[PDB]
Amino acid sequence: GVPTYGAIILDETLENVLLVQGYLAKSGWGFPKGKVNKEEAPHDCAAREVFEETGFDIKDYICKDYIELRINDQLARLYIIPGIPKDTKFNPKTRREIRNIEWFSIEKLPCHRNDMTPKSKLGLAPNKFFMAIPFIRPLRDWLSRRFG
Ligand SMILES: CCCc1cc(C(=O)NCc2ccc(F)cc2)[nH]n1
């Protein structure tokens, strides 16, 4: 697949992250991100997707040196943007693609989906944070290294 770029936006306390909820196939909560256009630079795609999806422009706050994961053939890179005040008014451009935009406490998000071992059944229970989950442990580790 085509690389995706976006951001992990944190508040001033570093306890909360900004997630967006789409529709249909993309009905759960995840970090704002999207497909790179041909000839577009990563930092530019990231700002554009985050602007389209949240109304907030990160261009002045991106530091070039993020968390990146190869998930089933596809790279997803989210630039880390700390210190965005919780009272920022976020508004998507395309309300046809984004249902809602909320802050979530990092410490209450799961960093793995639960199994179904009290049902003797294989796989994972559904989780509305499926798309965010793979970034939560790496973000927690990055915040420990960079801060304390
Ligand atoms: C395996 C289930 C597939 C899936 C993918 C997503 C998702 O990405 N939602 C968040 C989101 C929505 C819209 C958007 F523009 C940016 C992020 N949710 N469920």
Curated annotation (Swiss-Prot):
Q: Explain what the record says happens when changing residue 53 to Q.
A: Strongly reduced decapping activity
Instruction: Write out the annotated subcellular location.
Output: Cytoplasm, P-body; Nucleus
Residues that hold Mn(2+) according to the record: 49, 53
Report domain Nudix hydrolase positions: 1-130
Identify the domain of life: Eukaryota
Disulfide-bond pairs as recorded: none
Function recorded in the entry: Decapping metalloenzyme that catalyzes the cleavage of the cap structure on mRNAs. Removes the 7-methyl guanine cap structure from mRNA molecules, yielding a 5'-phosphorylated mRNA fragment and 7m-GDP. Necessary for the degradation of mRNAs, both in normal mRNA turnover and in nonsense-mediated mRNA decay. Plays a role in replication-dependent histone mRNA degradation. Has higher activity towards mRNAs that lack a poly(A) tail. Has no activity towards a cap structure lacking an RNA moiety.
What assembly does the database describe for this protein? Found in a mRNA decay complex with LSM1, LSM3, LSM4, EXOSC2, EXOSC4, EXOSC10, PARN, XRN1, CNOT6, UPF1, UPF2 and UPF3B. Forms a complex with DCP1A, EDC3, DDX6 and EDC4/HEDLS, within this complex directly interacts with EDC4/HEDLS. Interacts with DPC1B. Interacts (via N-terminus and C-terminus) with TRIM21 (via N-terminus and C-terminus). Associates with polysomes. Interacts with LIMD1, WTIP and AJUBA. Interacts with DDX17 in an RNA-dependent manner. Interacts with ZC3HAV1. Interacts with APOBEC3G in an RNA-dependent manner. Interacts with ZFP36L1 (via N-terminus). Interacts with NBDY.
Q: Tell me the protein family, please.
A: Belongs to the Nudix hydrolase family. DCP2 subfamily.
What is the protein name stated in its UniProt record?
m7GpppN-mRNA hydrolase
Which part of the entire protein is covered?
Answer: 96 to 244 of 420
